[PDB]
mmCIF file with all atom_site columns, C-alpha atoms (C1' of nucleotides) in Angstrom:
data_model
loop_
_atom_site.group_PDB
_atom_site.id
_atom_site.type_symbol
_atom_site.label_atom_id
_atom_site.label_alt_id
_atom_site.label_comp_id
_atom_site.label_asym_id
_atom_site.label_entity_id
_atom_site.label_seq_id
_atom_site.pdbx_PDB_ins_code
_atom_site.Cartn_x
_atom_site.Cartn_y
_atom_site.Cartn_z
_atom_site.occupancy
_atom_site.B_iso_or_equiv
_atom_site.pdbx_formal_charge
_atom_site.auth_seq_id
_atom_site.auth_comp_id
_atom_site.auth_asym_id
_atom_site.auth_atom_id
_atom_site.pdbx_PDB_model_num
ATOM 1   C CA    . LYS A 1 1   ? -11.330 -53.096 -27.120 1.00 0.00 ? 1   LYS A CA    1
ATOM 2   C CA    . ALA A 1 2   ? -12.353 -52.661 -23.459 1.00 0.00 ? 2   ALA A CA    1
ATOM 3   C CA    . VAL A 1 3   ? -15.426 -54.576 -22.194 1.00 0.00 ? 3   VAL A CA    1
ATOM 4   C CA    . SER A 1 4   ? -17.474 -53.381 -19.174 1.00 0.00 ? 4   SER A CA    1
ATOM 5   C CA    . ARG A 1 5   ? -17.935 -55.372 -15.960 1.00 0.00 ? 5   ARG A CA    1
ATOM 6   C CA    . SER A 1 6   ? -21.673 -54.577 -15.984 1.00 0.00 ? 6   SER A CA    1
ATOM 7   C CA    . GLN A 1 7   ? -21.964 -56.755 -19.158 1.00 0.00 ? 7   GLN A CA    1
ATOM 8   C CA    . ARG A 1 8   ? -20.139 -59.724 -17.583 1.00 0.00 ? 8   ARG A CA    1
ATOM 9   C CA    . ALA A 1 9   ? -22.572 -59.713 -14.635 1.00 0.00 ? 9   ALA A CA    1
ATOM 10  C CA    . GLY A 1 10  ? -25.527 -59.038 -16.975 1.00 0.00 ? 10  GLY A CA    1
ATOM 11  C CA    . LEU A 1 11  ? -26.570 -55.816 -15.158 1.00 0.00 ? 11  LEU A CA    1
ATOM 12  C CA    . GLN A 1 12  ? -27.723 -52.349 -16.226 1.00 0.00 ? 12  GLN A CA    1
ATOM 13  C CA    . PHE A 1 13  ? -26.273 -50.607 -13.146 1.00 0.00 ? 13  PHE A CA    1
ATOM 14  C CA    . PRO A 1 14  ? -22.641 -49.429 -12.868 1.00 0.00 ? 14  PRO A CA    1
ATOM 15  C CA    . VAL A 1 15  ? -20.607 -52.262 -11.321 1.00 0.00 ? 15  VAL A CA    1
ATOM 16  C CA    . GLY A 1 16  ? -17.394 -50.200 -11.354 1.00 0.00 ? 16  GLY A CA    1
ATOM 17  C CA    . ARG A 1 17  ? -18.786 -46.930 -9.951  1.00 0.00 ? 17  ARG A CA    1
ATOM 18  C CA    . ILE A 1 18  ? -19.839 -49.155 -7.100  1.00 0.00 ? 18  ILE A CA    1
ATOM 19  C CA    . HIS A 1 19  ? -16.603 -50.755 -5.941  1.00 0.00 ? 19  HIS A CA    1
ATOM 20  C CA    . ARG A 1 20  ? -15.098 -47.246 -6.080  1.00 0.00 ? 20  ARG A CA    1
ATOM 21  C CA    . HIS A 1 21  ? -17.945 -46.153 -3.743  1.00 0.00 ? 21  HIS A CA    1
ATOM 22  C CA    . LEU A 1 22  ? -17.474 -49.102 -1.404  1.00 0.00 ? 22  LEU A CA    1
ATOM 23  C CA    . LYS A 1 23  ? -13.696 -48.505 -1.365  1.00 0.00 ? 23  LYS A CA    1
ATOM 24  C CA    . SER A 1 24  ? -14.539 -45.182 0.386   1.00 0.00 ? 24  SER A CA    1
ATOM 25  C CA    . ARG A 1 25  ? -16.544 -46.866 3.234   1.00 0.00 ? 25  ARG A CA    1
ATOM 26  C CA    . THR A 1 26  ? -14.046 -49.520 4.267   1.00 0.00 ? 26  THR A CA    1
ATOM 27  C CA    . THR A 1 27  ? -12.215 -49.161 7.664   1.00 0.00 ? 27  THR A CA    1
ATOM 28  C CA    . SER A 1 28  ? -8.569  -49.159 6.338   1.00 0.00 ? 28  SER A CA    1
ATOM 29  C CA    . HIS A 1 29  ? -8.828  -52.263 4.051   1.00 0.00 ? 29  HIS A CA    1
ATOM 30  C CA    . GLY A 1 30  ? -9.899  -53.588 0.615   1.00 0.00 ? 30  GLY A CA    1
ATOM 31  C CA    . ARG A 1 31  ? -13.040 -54.964 -1.191  1.00 0.00 ? 31  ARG A CA    1
ATOM 32  C CA    . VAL A 1 32  ? -13.334 -58.095 -3.312  1.00 0.00 ? 32  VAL A CA    1
ATOM 33  C CA    . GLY A 1 33  ? -14.314 -57.651 -6.959  1.00 0.00 ? 33  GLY A CA    1
ATOM 34  C CA    . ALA A 1 34  ? -17.104 -60.287 -6.560  1.00 0.00 ? 34  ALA A CA    1
ATOM 35  C CA    . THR A 1 35  ? -18.762 -57.919 -4.067  1.00 0.00 ? 35  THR A CA    1
ATOM 36  C CA    . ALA A 1 36  ? -19.728 -55.314 -6.659  1.00 0.00 ? 36  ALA A CA    1
ATOM 37  C CA    . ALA A 1 37  ? -21.552 -58.014 -8.670  1.00 0.00 ? 37  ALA A CA    1
ATOM 38  C CA    . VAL A 1 38  ? -24.022 -58.974 -5.754  1.00 0.00 ? 38  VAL A CA    1
ATOM 39  C CA    . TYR A 1 39  ? -23.927 -55.473 -4.245  1.00 0.00 ? 39  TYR A CA    1
ATOM 40  C CA    . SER A 1 40  ? -25.383 -54.462 -7.572  1.00 0.00 ? 40  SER A CA    1
ATOM 41  C CA    . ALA A 1 41  ? -28.268 -56.756 -8.516  1.00 0.00 ? 41  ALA A CA    1
ATOM 42  C CA    . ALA A 1 42  ? -29.304 -56.218 -4.881  1.00 0.00 ? 42  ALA A CA    1
ATOM 43  C CA    . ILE A 1 43  ? -29.860 -52.513 -5.630  1.00 0.00 ? 43  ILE A CA    1
ATOM 44  C CA    . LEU A 1 44  ? -31.138 -53.170 -9.071  1.00 0.00 ? 44  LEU A CA    1
ATOM 45  C CA    . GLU A 1 45  ? -33.893 -55.685 -8.138  1.00 0.00 ? 45  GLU A CA    1
ATOM 46  C CA    . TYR A 1 46  ? -35.244 -53.065 -5.755  1.00 0.00 ? 46  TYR A CA    1
ATOM 47  C CA    . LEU A 1 47  ? -35.770 -51.109 -8.912  1.00 0.00 ? 47  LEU A CA    1
ATOM 48  C CA    . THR A 1 48  ? -38.141 -53.472 -10.749 1.00 0.00 ? 48  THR A CA    1
ATOM 49  C CA    . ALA A 1 49  ? -39.936 -53.728 -7.454  1.00 0.00 ? 49  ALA A CA    1
ATOM 50  C CA    . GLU A 1 50  ? -40.214 -49.955 -6.685  1.00 0.00 ? 50  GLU A CA    1
ATOM 51  C "C1'" . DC  B 2 1   ? -88.844 -34.108 -5.943  1.00 0.00 ? 1   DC  B "C1'" 1
ATOM 52  C "C1'" . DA  B 2 2   ? -84.875 -29.960 -6.012  1.00 0.00 ? 2   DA  B "C1'" 1
ATOM 53  C "C1'" . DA  B 2 3   ? -80.762 -28.556 -5.442  1.00 0.00 ? 3   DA  B "C1'" 1
ATOM 54  C "C1'" . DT  B 2 4   ? -75.643 -28.439 -4.800  1.00 0.00 ? 4   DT  B "C1'" 1
ATOM 55  C "C1'" . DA  B 2 5   ? -72.165 -31.085 -6.009  1.00 0.00 ? 5   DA  B "C1'" 1
ATOM 56  C "C1'" . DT  B 2 6   ? -68.875 -34.492 -8.356  1.00 0.00 ? 6   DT  B "C1'" 1
ATOM 57  C "C1'" . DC  B 2 7   ? -67.824 -36.520 -12.608 1.00 0.00 ? 7   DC  B "C1'" 1
ATOM 58  C "C1'" . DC  B 2 8   ? -66.571 -36.361 -17.432 1.00 0.00 ? 8   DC  B "C1'" 1
ATOM 59  C "C1'" . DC  B 2 9   ? -65.198 -34.879 -22.049 1.00 0.00 ? 9   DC  B "C1'" 1
ATOM 60  C "C1'" . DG  B 2 10  ? -63.008 -31.859 -25.578 1.00 0.00 ? 10  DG  B "C1'" 1
ATOM 61  C "C1'" . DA  B 2 11  ? -59.983 -27.166 -26.820 1.00 0.00 ? 11  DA  B "C1'" 1
ATOM 62  C "C1'" . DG  B 2 12  ? -56.461 -24.953 -26.198 1.00 0.00 ? 12  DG  B "C1'" 1
ATOM 63  C "C1'" . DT  B 2 13  ? -52.072 -24.654 -23.701 1.00 0.00 ? 13  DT  B "C1'" 1
ATOM 64  C "C1'" . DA  B 2 14  ? -45.815 -23.905 -22.357 1.00 0.00 ? 14  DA  B "C1'" 1
ATOM 65  C "C1'" . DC  B 2 15  ? -42.471 -26.309 -21.584 1.00 0.00 ? 15  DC  B "C1'" 1
ATOM 66  C "C1'" . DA  B 2 16  ? -40.250 -30.948 -20.177 1.00 0.00 ? 16  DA  B "C1'" 1
ATOM 67  C "C1'" . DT  B 2 17  ? -38.514 -34.413 -21.747 1.00 0.00 ? 17  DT  B "C1'" 1
ATOM 68  C "C1'" . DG  B 2 18  ? -36.285 -37.082 -24.241 1.00 0.00 ? 18  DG  B "C1'" 1
ATOM 69  C "C1'" . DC  B 2 19  ? -32.859 -36.755 -27.476 1.00 0.00 ? 19  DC  B "C1'" 1
ATOM 70  C "C1'" . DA  B 2 20  ? -28.359 -35.610 -30.107 1.00 0.00 ? 20  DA  B "C1'" 1
ATOM 71  C "C1'" . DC  B 2 21  ? -23.850 -33.627 -29.408 1.00 0.00 ? 21  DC  B "C1'" 1
ATOM 72  C "C1'" . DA  B 2 22  ? -18.892 -32.510 -27.800 1.00 0.00 ? 22  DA  B "C1'" 1
ATOM 73  C "C1'" . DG  B 2 23  ? -15.510 -34.047 -24.897 1.00 0.00 ? 23  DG  B "C1'" 1
ATOM 74  C "C1'" . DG  B 2 24  ? -13.263 -35.295 -20.579 1.00 0.00 ? 24  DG  B "C1'" 1
ATOM 75  C "C1'" . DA  B 2 25  ? -11.992 -38.100 -16.613 1.00 0.00 ? 25  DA  B "C1'" 1
ATOM 76  C "C1'" . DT  B 2 26  ? -11.996 -42.608 -15.282 1.00 0.00 ? 26  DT  B "C1'" 1
ATOM 77  C "C1'" . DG  B 2 27  ? -12.782 -47.445 -15.886 1.00 0.00 ? 27  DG  B "C1'" 1
ATOM 78  C "C1'" . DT  B 2 28  ? -10.263 -50.597 -18.063 1.00 0.00 ? 28  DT  B "C1'" 1
ATOM 79  C "C1'" . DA  B 2 29  ? -6.149  -53.589 -18.844 1.00 0.00 ? 29  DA  B "C1'" 1
ATOM 80  C "C1'" . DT  B 2 30  ? -1.669  -55.862 -17.703 1.00 0.00 ? 30  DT  B "C1'" 1
ATOM 81  C "C1'" . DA  B 2 31  ? 1.848   -56.896 -14.679 1.00 0.00 ? 31  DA  B "C1'" 1
ATOM 82  C "C1'" . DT  B 2 32  ? 3.256   -57.264 -10.021 1.00 0.00 ? 32  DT  B "C1'" 1
ATOM 83  C "C1'" . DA  B 2 33  ? 2.338   -58.276 -5.024  1.00 0.00 ? 33  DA  B "C1'" 1
ATOM 84  C "C1'" . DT  B 2 34  ? 2.283   -59.880 -0.424  1.00 0.00 ? 34  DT  B "C1'" 1
ATOM 85  C "C1'" . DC  B 2 35  ? -0.252  -61.238 2.468   1.00 0.00 ? 35  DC  B "C1'" 1
ATOM 86  C "C1'" . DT  B 2 36  ? -5.062  -62.107 4.252   1.00 0.00 ? 36  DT  B "C1'" 1
ATOM 87  C "C1'" . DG  B 2 37  ? -6.758  -65.618 5.881   1.00 0.00 ? 37  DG  B "C1'" 1
ATOM 88  C "C1'" . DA  B 2 38  ? -8.068  -70.307 4.057   1.00 0.00 ? 38  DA  B "C1'" 1
ATOM 89  C "C1'" . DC  B 2 39  ? -7.201  -74.325 5.508   1.00 0.00 ? 39  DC  B "C1'" 1
ATOM 90  C "C1'" . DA  B 2 40  ? -5.569  -77.399 7.733   1.00 0.00 ? 40  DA  B "C1'" 1
ATOM 91  C "C1'" . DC  B 2 41  ? -4.322  -79.242 12.241  1.00 0.00 ? 41  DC  B "C1'" 1
ATOM 92  C "C1'" . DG  B 2 42  ? -5.116  -80.508 17.047  1.00 0.00 ? 42  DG  B "C1'" 1
ATOM 93  C "C1'" . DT  B 2 43  ? -6.929  -78.553 22.489  1.00 0.00 ? 43  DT  B "C1'" 1
ATOM 94  C "C1'" . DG  B 2 44  ? -9.791  -78.710 25.906  1.00 0.00 ? 44  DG  B "C1'" 1
ATOM 95  C "C1'" . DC  B 2 45  ? -14.681 -76.955 27.498  1.00 0.00 ? 45  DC  B "C1'" 1
ATOM 96  C "C1'" . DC  B 2 46  ? -19.154 -76.613 27.860  1.00 0.00 ? 46  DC  B "C1'" 1
ATOM 97  C "C1'" . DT  B 2 47  ? -23.012 -77.679 25.940  1.00 0.00 ? 47  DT  B "C1'" 1
ATOM 98  C "C1'" . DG  B 2 48  ? -25.327 -81.186 26.813  1.00 0.00 ? 48  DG  B "C1'" 1
ATOM 99  C "C1'" . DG  B 2 49  ? -26.981 -85.021 28.798  1.00 0.00 ? 49  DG  B "C1'" 1
ATOM 100 C "C1'" . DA  B 2 50  ? -29.184 -87.749 32.644  1.00 0.00 ? 50  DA  B "C1'" 1
ATOM 101 C "C1'" . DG  B 2 51  ? -31.062 -88.665 38.171  1.00 0.00 ? 51  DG  B "C1'" 1
ATOM 102 C "C1'" . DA  B 2 52  ? -33.114 -87.865 42.600  1.00 0.00 ? 52  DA  B "C1'" 1
ATOM 103 C "C1'" . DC  B 2 53  ? -35.539 -84.972 45.284  1.00 0.00 ? 53  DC  B "C1'" 1
ATOM 104 C "C1'" . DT  B 2 54  ? -38.031 -81.517 47.512  1.00 0.00 ? 54  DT  B "C1'" 1
ATOM 105 C "C1'" . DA  B 2 55  ? -41.120 -77.395 47.742  1.00 0.00 ? 55  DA  B "C1'" 1
ATOM 106 C "C1'" . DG  B 2 56  ? -42.963 -73.775 44.987  1.00 0.00 ? 56  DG  B "C1'" 1
ATOM 107 C "C1'" . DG  B 2 57  ? -45.828 -72.992 41.993  1.00 0.00 ? 57  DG  B "C1'" 1
ATOM 108 C "C1'" . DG  B 2 58  ? -49.457 -73.949 39.147  1.00 0.00 ? 58  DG  B "C1'" 1
ATOM 109 C "C1'" . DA  B 2 59  ? -53.941 -75.386 38.299  1.00 0.00 ? 59  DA  B "C1'" 1
ATOM 110 C "C1'" . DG  B 2 60  ? -58.099 -76.015 39.873  1.00 0.00 ? 60  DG  B "C1'" 1
ATOM 111 C "C1'" . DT  B 2 61  ? -62.354 -74.590 42.150  1.00 0.00 ? 61  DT  B "C1'" 1
ATOM 112 C "C1'" . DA  B 2 62  ? -65.982 -71.600 44.714  1.00 0.00 ? 62  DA  B "C1'" 1
ATOM 113 C "C1'" . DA  B 2 63  ? -68.219 -67.654 45.832  1.00 0.00 ? 63  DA  B "C1'" 1
ATOM 114 C "C1'" . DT  B 2 64  ? -69.341 -63.125 44.400  1.00 0.00 ? 64  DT  B "C1'" 1
ATOM 115 C "C1'" . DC  B 2 65  ? -70.036 -57.973 43.253  1.00 0.00 ? 65  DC  B "C1'" 1
ATOM 116 C "C1'" . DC  B 2 66  ? -66.878 -54.943 41.218  1.00 0.00 ? 66  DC  B "C1'" 1
ATOM 117 C "C1'" . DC  B 2 67  ? -66.451 -53.076 37.426  1.00 0.00 ? 67  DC  B "C1'" 1
ATOM 118 C "C1'" . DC  B 2 68  ? -67.899 -53.003 33.311  1.00 0.00 ? 68  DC  B "C1'" 1
ATOM 119 C "C1'" . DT  B 2 69  ? -71.597 -52.181 30.578  1.00 0.00 ? 69  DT  B "C1'" 1
ATOM 120 C "C1'" . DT  B 2 70  ? -75.958 -49.914 29.006  1.00 0.00 ? 70  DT  B "C1'" 1
ATOM 121 C "C1'" . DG  B 2 71  ? -79.622 -46.682 28.783  1.00 0.00 ? 71  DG  B "C1'" 1
ATOM 122 C "C1'" . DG  B 2 72  ? -81.154 -42.711 29.255  1.00 0.00 ? 72  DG  B "C1'" 1
ATOM 123 C "C1'" . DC  B 2 73  ? -79.701 -38.624 30.857  1.00 0.00 ? 73  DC  B "C1'" 1
ATOM 124 C "C1'" . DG  B 2 74  ? -79.414 -32.926 30.258  1.00 0.00 ? 74  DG  B "C1'" 1
ATOM 125 C "C1'" . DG  B 2 75  ? -76.319 -29.286 28.382  1.00 0.00 ? 75  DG  B "C1'" 1
ATOM 126 C "C1'" . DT  B 2 76  ? -73.606 -26.951 25.201  1.00 0.00 ? 76  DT  B "C1'" 1
ATOM 127 C "C1'" . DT  B 2 77  ? -70.903 -26.282 21.447  1.00 0.00 ? 77  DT  B "C1'" 1
ATOM 128 C "C1'" . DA  B 2 78  ? -68.069 -27.440 16.272  1.00 0.00 ? 78  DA  B "C1'" 1
ATOM 129 C "C1'" . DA  B 2 79  ? -70.266 -27.125 12.128  1.00 0.00 ? 79  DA  B "C1'" 1
ATOM 130 C "C1'" . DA  B 2 80  ? -72.746 -24.392 8.462   1.00 0.00 ? 80  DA  B "C1'" 1
ATOM 131 C "C1'" . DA  B 2 81  ? -72.938 -20.606 6.000   1.00 0.00 ? 81  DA  B "C1'" 1
ATOM 132 C "C1'" . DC  B 2 82  ? -72.494 -16.229 5.359   1.00 0.00 ? 82  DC  B "C1'" 1
ATOM 133 C "C1'" . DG  B 2 83  ? -70.617 -11.867 5.352   1.00 0.00 ? 83  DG  B "C1'" 1
ATOM 134 C "C1'" . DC  B 2 84  ? -66.132 -9.370  5.240   1.00 0.00 ? 84  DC  B "C1'" 1
ATOM 135 C "C1'" . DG  B 2 85  ? -60.207 -7.787  5.764   1.00 0.00 ? 85  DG  B "C1'" 1
ATOM 136 C "C1'" . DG  B 2 86  ? -56.187 -7.828  4.784   1.00 0.00 ? 86  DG  B "C1'" 1
ATOM 137 C "C1'" . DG  B 2 87  ? -52.642 -10.462 3.190   1.00 0.00 ? 87  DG  B "C1'" 1
ATOM 138 C "C1'" . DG  B 2 88  ? -50.250 -13.910 0.390   1.00 0.00 ? 88  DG  B "C1'" 1
ATOM 139 C "C1'" . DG  B 2 89  ? -49.014 -13.298 -4.346  1.00 0.00 ? 89  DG  B "C1'" 1
ATOM 140 C "C1'" . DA  B 2 90  ? -46.256 -11.654 -8.817  1.00 0.00 ? 90  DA  B "C1'" 1
ATOM 141 C "C1'" . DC  B 2 91  ? -41.900 -8.293  -10.426 1.00 0.00 ? 91  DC  B "C1'" 1
ATOM 142 C "C1'" . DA  B 2 92  ? -37.401 -4.833  -10.615 1.00 0.00 ? 92  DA  B "C1'" 1
ATOM 143 C "C1'" . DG  B 2 93  ? -32.199 -5.049  -8.616  1.00 0.00 ? 93  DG  B "C1'" 1
ATOM 144 C "C1'" . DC  B 2 94  ? -27.119 -5.534  -4.835  1.00 0.00 ? 94  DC  B "C1'" 1
ATOM 145 C "C1'" . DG  B 2 95  ? -23.721 -7.530  -3.435  1.00 0.00 ? 95  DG  B "C1'" 1
ATOM 146 C "C1'" . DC  B 2 96  ? -22.517 -10.551 -0.453  1.00 0.00 ? 96  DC  B "C1'" 1
ATOM 147 C "C1'" . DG  B 2 97  ? -20.911 -15.681 -0.043  1.00 0.00 ? 97  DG  B "C1'" 1
ATOM 148 C "C1'" . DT  B 2 98  ? -19.755 -19.494 -2.040  1.00 0.00 ? 98  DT  B "C1'" 1
ATOM 149 C "C1'" . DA  B 2 99  ? -17.091 -21.432 -4.655  1.00 0.00 ? 99  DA  B "C1'" 1
ATOM 150 C "C1'" . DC  B 2 100 ? -12.550 -22.354 -6.427  1.00 0.00 ? 100 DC  B "C1'" 1
ATOM 151 C "C1'" . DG  B 2 101 ? -7.865  -21.778 -7.327  1.00 0.00 ? 101 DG  B "C1'" 1
ATOM 152 C "C1'" . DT  B 2 102 ? -2.980  -20.903 -5.252  1.00 0.00 ? 102 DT  B "C1'" 1
ATOM 153 C "C1'" . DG  B 2 103 ? 0.186   -21.772 -2.599  1.00 0.00 ? 103 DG  B "C1'" 1
ATOM 154 C "C1'" . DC  B 2 104 ? -0.302  -21.991 1.482   1.00 0.00 ? 104 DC  B "C1'" 1
ATOM 155 C "C1'" . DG  B 2 105 ? 3.574   -25.582 5.488   1.00 0.00 ? 105 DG  B "C1'" 1
ATOM 156 C "C1'" . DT  B 2 106 ? 1.129   -28.805 10.080  1.00 0.00 ? 106 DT  B "C1'" 1
ATOM 157 C "C1'" . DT  B 2 107 ? 0.950   -32.932 11.093  1.00 0.00 ? 107 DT  B "C1'" 1
ATOM 158 C "C1'" . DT  B 2 108 ? 0.630   -38.136 10.651  1.00 0.00 ? 108 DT  B "C1'" 1
ATOM 159 C "C1'" . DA  B 2 109 ? 2.220   -42.471 9.534   1.00 0.00 ? 109 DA  B "C1'" 1
ATOM 160 C "C1'" . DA  B 2 110 ? 6.008   -45.429 9.723   1.00 0.00 ? 110 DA  B "C1'" 1
ATOM 161 C "C1'" . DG  B 2 111 ? 9.606   -47.621 11.327  1.00 0.00 ? 111 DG  B "C1'" 1
ATOM 162 C "C1'" . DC  B 2 112 ? 12.880  -47.182 14.884  1.00 0.00 ? 112 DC  B "C1'" 1
ATOM 163 C "C1'" . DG  B 2 113 ? 14.211  -49.372 20.347  1.00 0.00 ? 113 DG  B "C1'" 1
ATOM 164 C "C1'" . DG  B 2 114 ? 13.140  -49.321 24.837  1.00 0.00 ? 114 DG  B "C1'" 1
ATOM 165 C "C1'" . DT  B 2 115 ? 10.043  -50.525 29.130  1.00 0.00 ? 115 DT  B "C1'" 1
ATOM 166 C "C1'" . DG  B 2 116 ? 6.379   -50.205 32.337  1.00 0.00 ? 116 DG  B "C1'" 1
ATOM 167 C "C1'" . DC  B 2 117 ? 1.273   -50.538 32.343  1.00 0.00 ? 117 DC  B "C1'" 1
ATOM 168 C "C1'" . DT  B 2 118 ? -2.332  -53.786 32.575  1.00 0.00 ? 118 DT  B "C1'" 1
ATOM 169 C "C1'" . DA  B 2 119 ? -4.551  -57.573 33.003  1.00 0.00 ? 119 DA  B "C1'" 1
ATOM 170 C "C1'" . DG  B 2 120 ? -4.779  -62.366 34.356  1.00 0.00 ? 120 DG  B "C1'" 1
ATOM 171 C "C1'" . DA  B 2 121 ? -3.187  -64.702 37.870  1.00 0.00 ? 121 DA  B "C1'" 1
ATOM 172 C "C1'" . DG  B 2 122 ? -4.527  -66.120 43.964  1.00 0.00 ? 122 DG  B "C1'" 1
ATOM 173 C "C1'" . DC  B 2 123 ? -7.500  -68.991 47.720  1.00 0.00 ? 123 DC  B "C1'" 1
ATOM 174 C "C1'" . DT  B 2 124 ? -5.382  -64.009 47.766  1.00 0.00 ? 124 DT  B "C1'" 1
ATOM 175 C "C1'" . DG  B 2 125 ? -8.230  -62.949 52.542  1.00 0.00 ? 125 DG  B "C1'" 1
ATOM 176 C "C1'" . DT  B 2 126 ? -11.826 -61.697 54.535  1.00 0.00 ? 126 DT  B "C1'" 1
ATOM 177 C "C1'" . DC  B 2 127 ? -16.565 -59.492 55.701  1.00 0.00 ? 127 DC  B "C1'" 1
ATOM 178 C "C1'" . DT  B 2 128 ? -20.348 -56.349 52.954  1.00 0.00 ? 128 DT  B "C1'" 1
ATOM 179 C "C1'" . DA  B 2 129 ? -24.175 -57.928 52.233  1.00 0.00 ? 129 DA  B "C1'" 1
ATOM 180 C "C1'" . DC  B 2 130 ? -27.368 -61.714 52.972  1.00 0.00 ? 130 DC  B "C1'" 1
ATOM 181 C "C1'" . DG  B 2 131 ? -30.505 -64.039 55.080  1.00 0.00 ? 131 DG  B "C1'" 1
ATOM 182 C "C1'" . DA  B 2 132 ? -32.732 -64.946 59.971  1.00 0.00 ? 132 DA  B "C1'" 1
ATOM 183 C "C1'" . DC  B 2 133 ? -34.664 -63.721 63.390  1.00 0.00 ? 133 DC  B "C1'" 1
ATOM 184 C "C1'" . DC  B 2 134 ? -36.438 -60.504 66.901  1.00 0.00 ? 134 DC  B "C1'" 1
ATOM 185 C "C1'" . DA  B 2 135 ? -38.919 -56.462 68.453  1.00 0.00 ? 135 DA  B "C1'" 1
ATOM 186 C "C1'" . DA  B 2 136 ? -42.223 -51.655 67.974  1.00 0.00 ? 136 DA  B "C1'" 1
ATOM 187 C "C1'" . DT  B 2 137 ? -45.540 -49.256 66.233  1.00 0.00 ? 137 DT  B "C1'" 1
ATOM 188 C "C1'" . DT  B 2 138 ? -49.669 -47.784 64.509  1.00 0.00 ? 138 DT  B "C1'" 1
ATOM 189 C "C1'" . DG  B 2 139 ? -54.426 -48.604 63.506  1.00 0.00 ? 139 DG  B "C1'" 1
ATOM 190 C "C1'" . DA  B 2 140 ? -58.831 -50.743 63.684  1.00 0.00 ? 140 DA  B "C1'" 1
ATOM 191 C "C1'" . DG  B 2 141 ? -62.539 -52.976 65.676  1.00 0.00 ? 141 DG  B "C1'" 1
ATOM 192 C "C1'" . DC  B 2 142 ? -65.192 -54.737 69.988  1.00 0.00 ? 142 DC  B "C1'" 1
ATOM 193 C "C1'" . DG  B 2 143 ? -66.265 -54.432 74.658  1.00 0.00 ? 143 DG  B "C1'" 1
ATOM 194 C "C1'" . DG  B 2 144 ? -67.751 -51.644 78.122  1.00 0.00 ? 144 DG  B "C1'" 1
ATOM 195 C "C1'" . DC  B 2 145 ? -68.914 -47.727 81.264  1.00 0.00 ? 145 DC  B "C1'" 1
ATOM 196 C "C1'" . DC  B 2 146 ? -71.805 -43.252 81.079  1.00 0.00 ? 146 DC  B "C1'" 1
ATOM 197 C "C1'" . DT  B 2 147 ? -76.824 -37.843 78.984  1.00 0.00 ? 147 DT  B "C1'" 1
ATOM 198 C "C1'" . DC  B 2 148 ? -80.300 -37.061 76.765  1.00 0.00 ? 148 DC  B "C1'" 1
ATOM 199 C "C1'" . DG  B 2 149 ? -85.180 -37.130 73.321  1.00 0.00 ? 149 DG  B "C1'" 1
ATOM 200 C "C1'" . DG  B 2 150 ? -89.055 -38.966 72.129  1.00 0.00 ? 150 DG  B "C1'" 1
ATOM 201 C "C1'" . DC  B 2 151 ? -93.006 -41.760 74.301  1.00 0.00 ? 151 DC  B "C1'" 1
ATOM 202 C "C1'" . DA  B 2 152 ? -96.613 -43.715 78.607  1.00 0.00 ? 152 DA  B "C1'" 1
#
DNA sequence: CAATATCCCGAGTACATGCACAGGATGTATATATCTGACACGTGCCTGGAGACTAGGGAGTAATCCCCTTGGCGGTTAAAACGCGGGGGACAGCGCGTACGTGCGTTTAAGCGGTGCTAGAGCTGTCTACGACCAATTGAGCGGCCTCGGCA
């Protein structure tokens, strides 16, 4: 049974659709997995203010 | 006080939305990977501190009238409201582009070795530009000479 990384952060937003998005805006180099979990929850958190 | 207007409440009104569904593409999951760069280690520099002194500036004041500020000004239209015109609004279809799929083959990235371009070197080695001073010019205001208009 697969989990989802959204549940391990505790977030409603898609932590793995981000990551794949960031990996397309990246010079020629990679992106840490712990970036998607404070990339998200600093896009959610504008929702629930907007 | 009268009148035009905004506010408010209930009937009646399409479809919008939230949902359930099939299913597909991608997020996950595991194993592997090197290498980014974390971390650790000194190197050596400037950021900072700390003093003595002049001279530039800053702060202060004084005098004052410029400029702002105000009132009162006189003059003409945006607004008000109406009449009044045409124009923005709601349906029928064509086919052309856009998309999308196919197979189109151009070029880049990579790893190769060779080598010359550039960017840190100098006291380079000066000498443009940087003060320093002099000289010219114009303009403005103040005396001074000289015709004429209003008054004895």
